[PDB]
Amino acid sequence: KVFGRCELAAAMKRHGLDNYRGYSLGNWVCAAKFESNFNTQATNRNTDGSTDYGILQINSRWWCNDGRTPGSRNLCNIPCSALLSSDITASVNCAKKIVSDGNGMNAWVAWRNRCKGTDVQAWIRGCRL
Ligand code: NA
Ligand code: NA
């Protein structure tokens, strides 16, 4: 599924990401924009052979099992394909673990390079929330 900007904002807010570990909703929307263009089916290979999945490009190196990432973990206890669903629950619950793990949103390279330090509230302008 390709979410609309405000559509995703609303789903993310309903799932409890607005100020989760202090990251305002616009941080999450910004991250999703640059990780997946709001596309739940997005997949991209990493140099180390792991793969990033779904709307927040969650990595098979640590967080999910895709059956082909050797010496990896599955800290969210999910197949990686669950992160490609039109329903974002599994990505959101997994993101909550990731963001809590010490490095906050810096775990998302797109967030650190394109959102951090910017006026991320722009990402939710116009949205009924
Ligand atoms: Na990425
Ligand atoms: Na943090």
Curated annotation (Swiss-Prot):
Keywords: Allergen, Antimicrobial, Bacteriolytic enzyme, Disulfide bond, Glycosidase, Hydrolase, Secreted, Signal. It catalyses: Hydrolysis of (1->4)-beta-linkages between N-acetylmuramic acid and N-acetyl-D-glucosamine residues in a peptidoglycan and between N-acetyl-D-glucosamine residues in chitodextrins. Substrate binds at residue 101. GO terms for biological process: cell wall macromolecule catabolic process; defense response to bacterium; defense response to Gram-negative bacterium; defense response to Gram-positive bacterium; killing of cells of another organism. It is found in: Secreted. PROSITE patterns: GLYCOSYL_HYDROL_F22_1, GLYCOSYL_HYDROL_F22_2. Monomer. This is Lysozyme C.
